[PDB]
Design a protein around this nucleic acid. Structure first.
Ligand SMILES: [Mg+2]
Ligand SMILES: [Mg+2]
Ligand SMILES: [Mg+2]
Length: 802
RNA sequence: UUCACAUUGCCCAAGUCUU
RNA sequence: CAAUGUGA
């Protein structure tokens, strides 16, 4: 239950396509490099400060120790191309910097020869410690030149300024990572951008925050309304006077009246520093320890450069950010290439110390474009849809199994002035028309239609409906826009009363269109238990010859900066042989834990419901797990694979179905581009839907592939990466690749191939719904949150999450 | 809250050292 | 899913 399976074979399906990847081939020398442990007292220092210490320590002790150019990981690991005068002997060094003790112990040799063998068929697995060393080599210089953020590097772009307002601006940067592959070692490079605080005087920072055209408007002290807004923006930020300080608070009193025991601030700077403040009417920054009385005037302070903006951007700052960084696929391709030529890695003195060479051109890789499956619809017509470039339509087609809607109601929470009875009548006309074409006929008018206001009217209205109207199938809820009513409608519908609801924005009622209404019917039919369509049965892979269940799993974590909100784990399982219908389980779990804690219980529920639905027991389980990074593969696989087994074992026997465990990663830094201009699709110029890459850039020994299953509308498509961590079923590359691709076509909310398999997509929708059930509510704590996300008995077997 | 795609927010990573 | 864009 541990080591992943090797690649069984290579795919042969689909026509070939010429691609370029943002991977850059690396030539590594076959020489031993020397690894040294370090220790710096004190070691509470920031990572950047540790690099400084070693920086000077290396030059201060050039003679008799560092005669050459070593690299340092910022904590405790130092690498040299040639050995030092050491042995395993410690060396206590005393270093000085505008008071540190640095100890240096040898630890081991790192053979780059053993890496060539691992990348070959010679060695079974890739030595992590070797990949780690190469990474520190490539990161040494940029970790000091630029501002490190994750695996990326950022800097103020020379000659340009991308202001966001509020004292913030866009910095451009790039991601950098070292990866083994079937071919060589690869440097993965991709461009990015993020928000940074402008390194400007605090005075200018105030003006942008408070929206002043200039200071001196006015020369009166700030209103508490202004002083609070400004305090919220600058608190926690670092400022400089030679001397750096983090702002912990903004004083209430102006510098002229704000005092401290040794006297007003404006007077202290008059006497001690001989400075007369130009704006004494303004408050002071309290800096350092919150429990001391260190106050700086705004005039003598700058925001120190290189501080990323962690807080959420405003709506306008966001809009600005999007415009500044949006790029078609070809444009992004050129931005990466331009960056790399300018990057000039090969002139890096440290890269060259270790004799590493980096190719300045994108690796060429051959992909295949898989054929889409045929989609089977219903009605008498029984039409077959044929996806083209990842898209099809429902025109002249009807659901495989459409629901007849006899009893339904409308509840309009939009103001009657805004959303008229006429609007509602007209909306009902068009929806019924579209529902007829669509195969899910709404046979009559709503049995109930009443205006209402506020979250309070929801539950009493829904209780009345459930009691009054027998066989009620659906409540359509009209909402004015963004409102807390939505979360309430879903609380009551999903968890309290177990009633199907379909919300619609007022603006989409006032002005409808055939495409919107059609998409709206896709959701409604599913919610009411229908089947929109199915994969052409005879076109499916062999796996469907025996009972199989398809599982999707995801964990969604709280936003950045949050500290106490729970993580939400969601698992969904197919309930028919199509596969189309899914049931869902959801749990709250520990803050920022990726491992699905209660998975065994969740899978047991799904297996039971599968048997109740199909009267089969799955002979195979295909589990698609979203969002686990490589550094978590072993941990996650260990717990979750055994959890699936546990579920089976506890159910019966000797019930041991084959498990295929697949990790899906949509958010990585691999990008694929069309080599030939006439292969690019649409305005965004992306690779076509179905493009598959299982060679060259993929893993040297293990079973992984990229599949870009969707049409790229805008920007640069993210090709989803799939990694097989376990496979009892012994899939070939072809079967697995085709299976995954076909499951991307079974997503009920649209007639498009989506970017990840339906089961994994549904798991996201389930987690996000739970998050809505928990709005403003996030042992005794756990049970409260657990109950909030527990859906009504009548909702359990439904696709309420659609 | 019609829907997908795209940027960010999510595990790993990153970050968290006299007035 | 939220903010912001591109689209159907
Ligand atoms: Mg996740
Ligand atoms: Mg960590
Ligand atoms: Mg959106």
């Amino acid at each position: 239950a541990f080591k992943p399976p090797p690649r069984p074979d290579f795919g042969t399906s689909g026509r070939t396509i010429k691609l370029q990847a943002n991977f850059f081939e690396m030539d590594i020398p076959k020489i031993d490099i020397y690894h040294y442990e370090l220790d710096i007292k004190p070691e509470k220092c920031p990572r950047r400060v540790n690099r400084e210490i070693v920086e000077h320590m290396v030059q201060h002790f050039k003679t008799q120790i560092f005669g050459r150019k070593p690299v340092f990981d910022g904590r405790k690991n130092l690498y040299t191309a040639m050995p030092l005068p050491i042995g395993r002997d410690k060396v206590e060094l005393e270093v000085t910097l505008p008071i540190f003790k640095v100890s240096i112990k040898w630890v081991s040799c790192v053979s780059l020869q053993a890496l060539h063998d691992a990348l070959s068929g010679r060695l079974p697995s890739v030595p992590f410690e070797t990949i780690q060393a190469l990474d520190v080599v490539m990161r040494h210089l940029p970790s000091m030149r630029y501002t490190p953020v994750g695996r990326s590097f950022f800097t103020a772009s020379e000659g340009c300024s991308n202001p966001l307002g509020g004292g913030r601006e866009v910095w451009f940067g790039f991601h950098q990572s070292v990866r083994p592959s079937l071919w060589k070692m690869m440097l993965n490079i991709d461009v990015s951008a993020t928000a940074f605080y402008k390194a400007q005087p605090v005075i200018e920072f105030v003006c942008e925050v408070l929206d002043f055209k200039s200071i001196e408007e006015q020369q009166k002290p700030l209103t508490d309304s202004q002083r609070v807004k400004f305090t919220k923006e600058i608190k926690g930020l670092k400022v400089e006077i030679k001397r750096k300080y983090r702002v912990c608070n903004v004083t209430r009193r102006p510098a002229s009246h704000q005092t401290f025991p040794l006297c007003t601030v404006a007077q202290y700077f008059k006497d001690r520093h001989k400075l007369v403040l130009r704006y004494p009417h303004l408050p002071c920054l309290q800096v350092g320890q919150e429990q001391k009385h260190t106050y700086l005037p705004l005039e003598v302070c700058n925001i120190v450069a290189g501080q990323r903006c962690i807080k959420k951007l405003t709506d306008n700052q966001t809009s600005t950010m999007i415009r500044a960084t949006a790029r078609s696929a070809p444009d992004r391709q050129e931005e990466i290439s331009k960056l790399m030529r300018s990057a000039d890695f090969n002139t890096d003195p440290y890269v060259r110390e270790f004799g590493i060479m980096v190719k300045d051109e994108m690796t060429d890789v051959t992909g295949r474009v898989l054929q889409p499956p045929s989609i089977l619809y219903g009605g008498r017509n029984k039409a077959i849809a044929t996806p083209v470039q990842g898209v099809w339509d429902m025109r002249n087609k009807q659901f495989h199994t459409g629901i007849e809607i006899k009893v339904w109601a409308i509840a309009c929470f939009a103001p009657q002035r805004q959303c008229t009875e006429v609007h509602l009548k007209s909306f009902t006309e068009q929806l019924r028309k579209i529902s007829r074409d669509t195969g899910m006929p709404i046979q009559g008018q709503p049995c109930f239609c009443k205006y209402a206001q506020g979250a309070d009217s929801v539950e009493p209205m829904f209780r009345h409906l459930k009691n009054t109207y027998a066989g009620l199938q659906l409540v359509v809820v009209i909402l004015p826009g963004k409102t807390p009513v939505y979360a309430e409608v879903k609380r009551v519908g999903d968890t309290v009363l177990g009633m199907a609801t379909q919300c619609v924005q007022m603006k989409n009622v006032q002005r409808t269109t055939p495409q919107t209404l059609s998409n709206l019917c896709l959701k409604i039919n599913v919610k009411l238990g229908g089947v929109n369509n199915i994969l052409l049965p005879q076109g499916r892979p062999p796996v469907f010859q025996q009972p199989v269940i398809f599982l999707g799993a995801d964990v969604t974590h709280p936003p950045a900066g949050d500290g106490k909100k729970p993580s939400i784990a969601a698992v969904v399982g197919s309930m028919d042989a199509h596969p189309n219908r899914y049931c869902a389980t959801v749990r709250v779990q520990q803050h920022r834990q990726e491992i699905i804690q209660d998975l065994a219980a969740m899978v047991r529920e799904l297996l039971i419901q599968f048997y109740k639905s199909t009267r089969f027991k799955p002979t195979r389980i295909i589990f698609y797990r979203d969002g686990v990074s490589e550094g978590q593969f072993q941990q996650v696989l260990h717990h979750e694979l055994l959890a699936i087994r546990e579920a089976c074992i506890k159910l019966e026997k000797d019930y041991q179905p084959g498990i295929t465990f697949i990790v899906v990663q949509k958010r990585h830094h691999t990008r694929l581009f069309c080599t030939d201009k006439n292969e690019r699709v649409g305005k965004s110029g992306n690779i076509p839907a179905g493009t598959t890459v299982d060679t060259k850039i993929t893993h040297p020994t293990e079973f992984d592939f990229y599949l870009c299953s969707h049409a790229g509308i805008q920007g640069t498509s993210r090709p989803s990466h799939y990694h097989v961590l376990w496979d009892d079923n012994r899939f070939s590359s072809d079967e697995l690749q085709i299976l995954t691709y076909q499951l991307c076509h079974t997503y009920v909310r649209c007639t498009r191939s989506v970017s990840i398999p339906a089961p994994a997509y549904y798991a996201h929708l389930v987690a996000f719904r739970a998050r809505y059930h928990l709005v403003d509510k996030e042992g005794r704590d756990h049970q409260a949150l657990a109950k909030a996300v527990q859906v009504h008995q009548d909702t359990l077997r439904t696709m309420y999450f659609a």
